[PDB]
Amino acid sequence: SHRKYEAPRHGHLGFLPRKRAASIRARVKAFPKDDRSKPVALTSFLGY
Amino acid sequence: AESHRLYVKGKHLSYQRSKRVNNPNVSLIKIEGVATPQDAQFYLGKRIAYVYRASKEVRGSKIRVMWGKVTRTHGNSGVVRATFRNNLPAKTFGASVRIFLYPSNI
Amino acid sequence: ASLPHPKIVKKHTKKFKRHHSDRYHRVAENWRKQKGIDSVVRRRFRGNISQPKIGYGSNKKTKFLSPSGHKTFLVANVKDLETLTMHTKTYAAEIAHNISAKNRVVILARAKALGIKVTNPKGRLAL
Amino acid sequence: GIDHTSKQHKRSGHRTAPKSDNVYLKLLVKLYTFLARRTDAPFNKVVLKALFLSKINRPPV
Amino acid sequence: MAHFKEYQVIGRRLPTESVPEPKLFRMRIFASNEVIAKSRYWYFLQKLHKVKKASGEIVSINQINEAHPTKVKNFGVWVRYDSRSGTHNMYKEIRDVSRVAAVETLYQDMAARHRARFRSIHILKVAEIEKTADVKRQYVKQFLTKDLKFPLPHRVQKSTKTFSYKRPSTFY
Amino acid sequence: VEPVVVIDGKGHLVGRLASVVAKQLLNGQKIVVVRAEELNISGEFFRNKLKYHDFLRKATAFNKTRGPFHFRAPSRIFYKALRGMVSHKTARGKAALERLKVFEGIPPPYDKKKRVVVPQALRVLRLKPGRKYTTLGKLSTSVGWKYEDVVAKLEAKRKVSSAEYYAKKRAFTKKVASANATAAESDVAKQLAALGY
RNA sequence: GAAAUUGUUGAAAGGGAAGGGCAUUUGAUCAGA
RNA sequence: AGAACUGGCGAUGCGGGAUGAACCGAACGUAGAGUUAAGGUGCCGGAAUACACGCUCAUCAGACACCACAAAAGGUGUUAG
RNA sequence: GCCCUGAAAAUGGAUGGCGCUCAAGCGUGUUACCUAUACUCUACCGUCAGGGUUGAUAUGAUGCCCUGACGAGUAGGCAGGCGUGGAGGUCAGUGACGAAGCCUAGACCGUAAGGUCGGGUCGAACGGCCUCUAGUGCAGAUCUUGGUGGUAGUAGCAAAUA
RNA sequence: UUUGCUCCACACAAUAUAGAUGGAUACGAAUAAGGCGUCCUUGUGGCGUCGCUGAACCAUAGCAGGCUAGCAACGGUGCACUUGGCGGAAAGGCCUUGGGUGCUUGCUGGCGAAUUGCAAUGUCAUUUUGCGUGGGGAUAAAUCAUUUGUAUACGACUUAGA
Numbered sequence A: 001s002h003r004k005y006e007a008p009r010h011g012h013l014g015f016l017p018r019k020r021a022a023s024i025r026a027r028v029k030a031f032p033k034d035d036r037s038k039p040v041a042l043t044s045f046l047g048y
Numbered sequence B: 001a002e003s004h005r006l007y008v009k010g011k012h013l014s015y016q017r018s019k020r021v022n023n024p025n026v027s028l029i030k031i032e033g034v035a036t037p038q039d040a041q042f043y044l045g046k047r048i049a050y051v052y053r054a055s056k057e058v059r060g061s062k063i064r065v066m067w068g069k070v071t072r073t074h075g076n077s078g079v080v081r082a083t084f085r086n087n088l089p090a091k092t093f094g095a096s097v098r099i100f101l102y103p104s105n106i
Numbered sequence C: 001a002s003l004p005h006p007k008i009v010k011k012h013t014k015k016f017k018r019h020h021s022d023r024y025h026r027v028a029e030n031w032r033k034q035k036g037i038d039s040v041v042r043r044r045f046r047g048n049i050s051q052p053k054i055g056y057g058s059n060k061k062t063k064f065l066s067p068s069g070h071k072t073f074l075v076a077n078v079k080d081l082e083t084l085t086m087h088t089k090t091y092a093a094e095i096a097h098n099i100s101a102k103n104r105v106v107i108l109a110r111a112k113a114l115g116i117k118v119t120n121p122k123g124r125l126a127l
Numbered sequence D: 001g002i003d004h005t006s007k008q009h010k011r012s013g014h015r016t017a018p019k020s021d022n023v024y025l026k027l028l029v030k031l032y033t034f035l036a037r038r039t040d041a042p043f044n045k046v047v048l049k050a051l052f053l054s055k056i057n058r059p060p061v
Numbered sequence E: 001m002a003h004f005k006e007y008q009v010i011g012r013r014l015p016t017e018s019v020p021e022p023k024l025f026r027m028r029i030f031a032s033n034e035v036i037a038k039s040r041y042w043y044f045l046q047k048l049h050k051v052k053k054a055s056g057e058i059v060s061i062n063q064i065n066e067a068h069p070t071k072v073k074n075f076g077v078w079v080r081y082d083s084r085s086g087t088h089n090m091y092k093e094i095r096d097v098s099r100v101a102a103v104e105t106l107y108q109d110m111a112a113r114h115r116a117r118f119r120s121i122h123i124l125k126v127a128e129i130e131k132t133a134d135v136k137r138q139y140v141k142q143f144l145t146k147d148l149k150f151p152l153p154h155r156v157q158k159s160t161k162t163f164s165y166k167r168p169s170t171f172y
Numbered sequence F: 001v002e003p004v005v006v007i008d009g010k011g012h013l014v015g016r017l018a019s020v021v022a023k024q025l026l027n028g029q030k031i032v033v034v035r036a037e038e039l040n041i042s043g044e045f046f047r048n049k050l051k052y053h054d055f056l057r058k059a060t061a062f063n064k065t066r067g068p069f070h071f072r073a074p075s076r077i078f079y080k081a082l083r084g085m086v087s088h089k090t091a092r093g094k095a096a097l098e099r100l101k102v103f104e105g106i107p108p109p110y111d112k113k114k115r116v117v118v119p120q121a122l123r124v125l126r127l128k129p130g131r132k133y134t135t136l137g138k139l140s141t142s143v144g145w146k147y148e149d150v151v152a153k154l155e156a157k158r159k160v161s162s163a164e165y166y167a168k169k170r171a172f173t174k175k176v177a178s179a180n181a182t183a184a185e186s187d188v189a190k191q192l193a194a195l196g197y
Numbered sequence G: 001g002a003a004a005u006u007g008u009u010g011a012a013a014g015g016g017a018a019g020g021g022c023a024u025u026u027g028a029u030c031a032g033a
Numbered sequence H: 001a002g003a004a005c006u007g008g009c010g011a012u013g014c015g016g017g018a019u020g021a022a023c024c025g026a027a028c029g030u031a032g033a034g035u036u037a038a039g040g041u042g043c044c045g046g047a048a049u050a051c052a053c054g055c056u057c058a059u060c061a062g063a064c065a066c067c068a069c070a071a072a073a074g075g076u077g078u079u080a081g
Numbered sequence I: 001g002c003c004c005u006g007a008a009a010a011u012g013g014a015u016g017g018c019g020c021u022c023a024a025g026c027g028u029g030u031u032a033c034c035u036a037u038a039c040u041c042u043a044c045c046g047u048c049a050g051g052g053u054u055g056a057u058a059u060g061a062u063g064c065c066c067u068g069a070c071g072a073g074u075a076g077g078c079a080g081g082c083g084u085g086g087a088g089g090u091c092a093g094u095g096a097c098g099a100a101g102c103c104u105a106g107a108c109c110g111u112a113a114g115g116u117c118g119g120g121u122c123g124a125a126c127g128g129c130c131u132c133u134a135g136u137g138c139a140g141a142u143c144u145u146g147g148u149g150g151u152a153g154u155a156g157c158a159a160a161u162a
Numbered sequence J: 001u002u003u004g005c006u007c008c009a010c011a012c013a014a015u016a017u018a019g020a021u022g023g024a025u026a027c028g029a030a031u032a033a034g035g036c037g038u039c040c041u042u043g044u045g046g047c048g049u050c051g052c053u054g055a056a057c058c059a060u061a062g063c064a065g066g067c068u069a070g071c072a073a074c075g076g077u078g079c080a081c082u083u084g085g086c087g088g089a090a091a092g093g094c095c096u097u098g099g100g101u102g103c104u105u106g107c108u109g110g111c112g113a114a115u116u117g118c119a120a121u122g123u124c125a126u127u128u129u130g131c132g133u134g135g136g137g138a139u140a141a142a143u144c145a146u147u148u149g150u151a152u153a154c155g156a157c158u159u160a161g162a
């Protein structure tokens, strides 16, 4: 039978699996779209 | 010459079979250049050799042969039926065989 | 050395092993016919073991013949061996399992003298 | 397959030898088997058949 | 049913002592063999007259060949057929060289367009249309225009081999 | 008849081409399929996109990583069509599938090799004129394939290089046709023509 | 001094069971002549 | 759920219907060869991507009886009357 | 007629799948081809039936031989055989120069129940044949007794202050 | 490192082969259109020609292909060098310069073959590995243990330590 009362599911299914990251430094999986008329510059920086 | 071949190339396709039951005693051979049973009638009775290699040398060679012969045509597309002294292993489905020109009637 | 015989044809050389004798140790390999109501082997479904039947019976001309063409005859002594004196082309003597070594030597010598084939001439030989 | 009109492997239903192990009766059966086979006299055949009969089928005369 | 032949079938309604020499009825039957021709003859005679095969006899069955098998003709065919919900009469026109070929085309066309099996079709009449402009179906009239020519675009040549090395062409 | 047969998949009616390739593989012929993005499927693009979405909605309910995998690339769509027709769960089917390679475009190993076609699978020969058809590259892009642009650019570069190669080959072929245009009235040429050559 | 069950050695195979039937390849082993 | 006749399953394997007690075909000693049944011949899968006439384009096409469903009513869709 | 609307159900999924669009779809027709333990022929096994053959060296006339046909099967009936403990007779049988038992992807015979042999272990009895006899054949019975596993080096060995 | 590692060449051993037995012989695009050749006013141009399958093209003769004598012509082809360029989609290949060298069946000769006994794949390929002989090249790390807490049930992770 149906849930008998609606409620949103707990948690976000797009952040699965809830596992340990493979590295302590998280990977940059997408860099800004290149604008090839601009001067050469870094798109990211590392800090603590 | 560069070529020394005195046999027609062929391929061991499968055993004689129904949908779900096979007959290892009879093998199906696709002979190169043969597209009709009328053509395959020429190759009826010709000897066939499956030639394979082994690690262990036996009687002065590391090459072994399974002998058979063409018995009849199969289907409408030039495939033939073949019987061998010992049935082909069935790992040779798709393997090459040699259809010799003897016994010759030319 | 034996009488001429047709080619010996064995219709079924594979042993008729009892169903599930490979599945359970308590089920011996000695053939037993399945009597079960639902037995797939008894009902002879395709893909199952074959059962012994009279059709497998060997040709009467080659039945009981060893590959040498002789029928095996068990012998316990020289008197037993000498029953094959006029039948050396049809029977081959097999010395009984419980014959001592010296009696085996005597039997072998007598069989050699009489031209009687011995199927197990190497039993209890000098080591 | 054969549509059998009669029972297959049906034994004749008549004795072909005495059930007795009497050696003398067996010798008589052999003699009258020879006579029935090689004389063509109906008497020999009926005597041979009578020699097979059981005790209740041979009432005293 | 198969490649058709036309037979004349003449039957008798077997004579009695009161009525010798009965009226000798005849039919033109399209069938693949003489057994089927006689069966169809008796079927239609039972549809038309008080007679059956047991009370009649086949006096003659003769194959009728096309008079001019190599002259292209327009045929008008009147047929009666049973649909899934009724019986209907239709008139069709077929261009062919013989009555048997026209009838084979008619059976194929009825099966294709009306799902009418052989058992459901009665051939009422097949007659040659002697004069053009008595052809009343456009799909035949279009083949009677003067100096009719037409191309065969997109020719598809059948390959004898599995693989081709040329990227073939459909020109014609 | 060749150790490796390279099929140019452009316009090749993916199902019929898959049948041909599966039979060749099971018969023991090594097949490499190039330009899988240019394959065709009969039926409208919307029809085939709906079919792919019906395929996409099929997945193991309790774990989607177990269910059917929906490969988006045209080469993998062709490979799925071919695996569904090869007995891929047996060792023989595994060997037959190992005898096969499918590519988008014509990668460097095969860009300088002869490409063949399968007339019984060719769209122009099989499909009735006017029937609508789908292009595998467009369908794959619509269902999530990411490399249509890269394959198109590399195909354009390869076609430029191949056109230069063919211009050179055509010039050499013209030279050869001139060379055998003469020496055709010589006695050797007349004897060859009398013998059919 | 059996079997169940177990250790060692040797051989062999092993992508979500294993075992089996027909057939043959390969390896090992062996009778008969 | 209950009767009539017959054939079957139970008691029955085999080929086909993917799969299935009953359907189709055919009933069974052990083998060889040939021919077939029902069913099939794109590939899985043995067997013509055979031949011939047409019909159908479906943004839920359709694809062999038992059998695994679809109706009334409608459509200048298209085809034939 | 085909197609479409009518046409809505719950895990993701089924012309069997792939896939198929002048089809690999539908209706129809013609051939060719594939294959059942089915049909035809032959061989072998057995059963049944009909016969021939005591004229001897023919010791197997329930023997030998000829001919034809047949062979599915639960419950069940019958027949012919295999094996076990013990008993009478016999082989003047086997055996401490090794009986019985046991082990043996070693060999032979039988369609089979089973039988025989080789090798290892072992130590004192045992077998073939003709008969007699039965407390005579196990996979089951939540069977009986005894022994042994996987679970598994697992659960756990944490109340009572240390 | 009880003389270790890697690469190359050769020899000898093993090891197998999803299956060589002349050549996978490279435009692109269209198919109710194209390919090729040629010409011009260079085009969506004119003219000619072709397809109707690769049944093609190349190659192909020589003790599985030997040993030699010439003729003709500066061609074809293999080998190891060599000049340079191009190719990154998986480039690992394509093209090219020069000389050397072997063969040349383009043509004409001389010698040899046998007895594998009338056939038996009658062994000619490539896949890895090992070993020995020479040459070329290089001279580290990881883990346990200790430590850290940005981590953690245990593993694991993250740190530090000549």
Ligand SMILES: [K+]
Pocket: C021, C022, C023, C024, C025, C026, C027, C028, C029
């Ligand atoms: K057991």
Ligand SMILES: [Mg+2]
Pocket: A002, A003, A004, A005, A006
């Ligand atoms: Mg709700």
Ligand SMILES: [Mg+2]
Pocket: C012, C013, C014, C015
């Ligand atoms: Mg046996």
Ligand SMILES: [Mg+2]
Pocket: C037, C038
């Ligand atoms: Mg039952």
Ligand SMILES: [Mg+2]
Pocket: D001, D002, I071
């Ligand atoms: Mg029968």
Ligand SMILES: [Mg+2]
Pocket: none
């Ligand atoms: Mg994604």
Ligand SMILES: [Mg+2]
Pocket: G001
């Ligand atoms: Mg003890």
Ligand SMILES: [Mg+2]
Pocket: none
């Ligand atoms: Mg044990």
Ligand SMILES: [Mg+2]
Pocket: none
């Ligand atoms: Mg696992």
Ligand SMILES: [Mg+2]
Pocket: H010
């Ligand atoms: Mg019951």
Ligand SMILES: [Mg+2]
Pocket: H012
């Ligand atoms: Mg039945």
Ligand SMILES: [Mg+2]
Pocket: H017
């Ligand atoms: Mg079904």
Ligand SMILES: [Mg+2]
Pocket: H046
């Ligand atoms: Mg096939």
Ligand SMILES: [Mg+2]
Pocket: none
């Ligand atoms: Mg309606």
Ligand SMILES: [Mg+2]
Pocket: none
């Ligand atoms: Mg509908």
Ligand SMILES: [Mg+2]
Pocket: none
């Ligand atoms: Mg089909």
